[PDB]
From Swiss-Prot:
This is Haloalkane dehalogenase. Chloride binds at W125, W175. Monomer. It comes from Xanthobacter autotrophicus. Residues 49-295 form the AB hydrolase-1 domain. Belongs to the haloalkane dehalogenase family. Type 1 subfamily. Keywords: Detoxification, Hydrolase. Pathway: Xenobiotic degradation; 1,2-dichloroethane degradation; glycolate from 1,2-dichloroethane: step 1/4. GO terms for molecular function: epoxide hydrolase activity; haloalkane dehalogenase activity. Gene3D superfamilies: alpha/beta hydrolase. The active site is at D124, D260, H289. It catalyses: 1-haloalkane + H2O = a halide anion + a primary alcohol + H(+); 1,2-dichloroethane + H2O = 2-chloroethanol + chloride + H(+).
Length: 310
């Protein structure tokens, strides 16, 4: 079994702009005893479902500006927290966290809730994982909103998606050094550095899930998994490419956080070329890596784009 700890609800008591009522699932196939938290907003009987996937080191809090917009259009919004993150249970051992550990959780959740007509909404690890889900059951997915993300494939198949692991020094090397080498990891202080428009209250909401380092085994493992891609990760990621090029016939919307040192234009303009029918990217000039902090514009533009297409 997997040994996990749970964050005290008290830590989430007064989160700025997070009025969303909690939903949980403690009975997922392959994840016994592990309770997963997810948001389930908007009309539950909606034709469209926006599945919003977060990355590192965030949780569904990152979608708080986008969720109202999507919901007001008549849609259902599902925003799950990865194990190790947010209000989900947190495995204490880093080795329990793998690519398939998170990917199979997502497949398990989509089946349990039986989600169809999915507009996939992705960024960072939500992208790395999320972009390999449509091929597993393509009839469930109808659209994609891709923000600063790509696939964890091998450096030969796609050099773009590995070159940042090399450089620049103030880029990935800094991002990884800040997350895996501090024994005193203050996620609010980290997020104030990498998302410099965050208010003090917003930033502390990113530290809320982690009372102390014993809750951060999953926050440490994600950077390590980018650097050291395992065979299952490469095979699934490289097979996902062929899906996006050849099989994908759904509506796509892309938005780039232009100030992002790691997963900005040089990762995203390759990513565009691989997604069949991907239009011109909305380039948000003032946005860094966490484009969802400029998410009200992205959400509105995506709905406008999708509506003026079909």
């Amino acid at each position: 079994m997997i040994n996990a700890i749970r964050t005290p609800d008290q830590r989430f008591s007064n989160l700025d702009q997070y009025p969303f009522s909690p939903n949980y699932l403690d009975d997922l196939p392959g994840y016994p005893g592990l309770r997963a938290h997810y948001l389930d907003e908007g009309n539950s009987d909606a034709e469209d479902v926006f599945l919003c996937l977060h990355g590192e080191p965030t949780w569904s809090y990152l979608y708080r500006k986008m969720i109202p917009v999507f919901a007001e259009s008549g849609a259902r919004v599902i925003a799950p927290d990865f194990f190790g993150f947010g209000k989900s249970d947190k495995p204490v051992d880093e080795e329990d966290y793998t690519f398939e550990f998170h990917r199979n959780f997502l497949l398990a959740l989509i089946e349990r809730l039986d989600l169809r007509n999915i507009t996939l909404v992705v960024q960072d690890w939500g992208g790395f994982l999320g972009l390999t889900l449509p091929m597993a059951d393509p009839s469930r997915f109808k659209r994609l909103i891709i923000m600063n993300a790509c696939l964890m494939t091998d450096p030969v198949t796609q050099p773009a998606f590995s070159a940042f692991v090399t450089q620049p020094a103030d880029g990935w090397t800094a991002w990884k050094y800040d997350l895996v080498t501090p024994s005193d990891l203050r996620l609010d202080q980290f997020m104030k550095r990498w998302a410099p428009t965050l208010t003090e209250a917003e930033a502390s909401a990113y530290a809320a899930p982690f009372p102390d380092t014993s809750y951060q085994a999953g926050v440490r493992k994600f950077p390590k998994m980018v650097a050291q891609r395992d065979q299952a990760c490469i095979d699934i990621s490289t097979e996902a490419i062929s899906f996006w090029q050849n099989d994908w016939n759904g509506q796509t919307f892309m938005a780039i956080g232009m100030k992002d040192k790691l997963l900005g234009p040089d990762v995203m303009y390759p990513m565009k070329a691989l997604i069949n029918g991907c239009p011109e990217p909305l380039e948000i000039a003032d946005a860094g890596h966490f484009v969802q902090e400029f998410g009200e514009q992205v959400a509105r533009e995506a709905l406008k784009h999708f509506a003026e297409t079909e």
